[PDB]
């Protein structure tokens, strides 16, 4: 019901995991660009994992503890050899800050969440994370 | 009390402001010179039509009058240093009908809030002489 962003480019193909009950972990694969994200989450009594955007890079796992929620997403998007992709990507929880991951500067974006949380993702993916957006909940 | 509050984009200067969410944003008026000086918002609180005056006195007004079917589904801008203070130097909004702005002429670190689903229902931020910062309430 509340979907924000898609920051990135038009390349790759669409993904959309919808909202979750709880995000368990977010694993950003990155080298000089953001290659991919794995999200594992619970959904109506089940645990699920998705992986958006290609093989590539080194993994950086954010694991969410008991009362921990994603309250921020930040990054940069730009042209990496002909595709507009997320060159840098970071997250913050109520407890700590992570990243950003990736080494390619571009047009910055930032989503601080003064009230609410990130409950899921949508965007575009191919060889790399072309774009990323976020579902929000109270 | 989801209010879902997104942002504050800008500096830590000035005094905090927070209008809460509205039943309906009637119009948003952005005061603008080489920086964003202020925002006035006229909206319907609980039966009543109030307006709030955020930021400072300012430069030149630019009014976005929303029409019945028209909702705010986007906010973009840039924040930067302006004589020793980090303020919003550029600010723009898009609705489901039209796109307004950006207003102001001081470039800086860009931000953007495309709302693929939902809309802006209210405003908060920081204000002094200019718009130090601005954020937004979201609802479906
Ligand atoms: C920003 O991109 C990287 O930085 C992280 C964090 O150190 C590394 O783990 C990763 O391999 C990349 O070199
Ligand atoms: C290299 O080819 C691809 O990978 C990039 C980056 O994800 C995409 O934008 C593109 O559409 C293809 O999927
Ligand atoms: C250029 O080499 C790298 O950067 C890319 C893009 O992020 C990764 O796929 C790869 O594993 C290396 O880290
Ligand atoms: C010039 O003095 C002030 O105006 C700026 C910009 O609004 C503020 O941060 C600051 O705290 C004071 O209120
Ligand atoms: C420097 O002159 C101006 O720019 C400032 C900041 O926007 C405004 O306060 C003033 O009204 C003029 O428009
Ligand atoms: Zn994976
Ligand atoms: Zn790591
Ligand atoms: Zn006013």
CATH of residue A16:
2.100.10.30
CB atoms within 10 A of CB B11: 20
Task: Report how many domains make up chain B.
Answer: 1
- The closest of B8, B9, B21 to B138, measured between CA atoms, is B21
Specify burial of residue B57 (Cβ count, 10 A radius: 0-12, 13-18, 19+): exposed
Beta bridge partners of A131: A8, A124
- Taking CB atoms and an 8 Å limit, are B114 and A138 in contact across chains? no
Q: E-assigned strands of chain B?
A: 5-10, 15-21, 24-32, 36-44, 49-51, 54-55, 60-65, 72-81, 86-95, 99-103, 109-117, 119-127, 133-139
Resolution (A): 2.5
Q: What are phi and psi of B84, to 5 degrees?
A: 90, 5
Strand pairing partners for A89? A75, A101
Ligand 5 centre from B132 Cα, in Å?
Answer: 14
C-alpha span between A93 and A69 (Å, rounded):
5
User: Which structural domain range is residue B55 located in?
Assistant: 1-140
- Single out the residue of B118, B76, B69, B121 nearest to residue B94, CA to CA: B76
Ligand 2 neighbourhood includes A52 CB (under 6 angstroms)? no
Any atom of ligand 1 within 6 Å of the Cβ of A102: yes
- Expt. technique: X-ray
Among B113, B109, B116, which residue's Cα sits nearest to residue B137? B113
């Amino acid at each position: 019901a509340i979907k924000v962003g898609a920051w990135g480019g038009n390349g790759g193909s669409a993904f959309d995991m919808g909202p979750a009950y709880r995000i368990i972990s977010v694993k950003i694969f990155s080298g000089d660009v953001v290659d991919a994200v794995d999200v594992t989450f619970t959904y109506y009594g089940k645990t699920e994992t998705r992986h958006f955007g290609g093989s590539g890079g080194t993994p950086h796992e954010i694991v969410l503890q008991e009362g921990e929620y994603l309250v921020g997403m930040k990054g940069e998007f730009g042209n990496y050899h002909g595709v507009v992709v997320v060159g840098k990507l970071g997250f913050s929880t109520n407890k700590k800050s992570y990243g950003p991951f990736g080494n390619t500067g571009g047009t910055p974006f930032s989503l601080p969440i003064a009230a609410g949380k990130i409950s899921g993702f949508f965007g575009r993916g191919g060889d790399f994370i072309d774009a990323i957006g976020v579902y929000l909940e109270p």
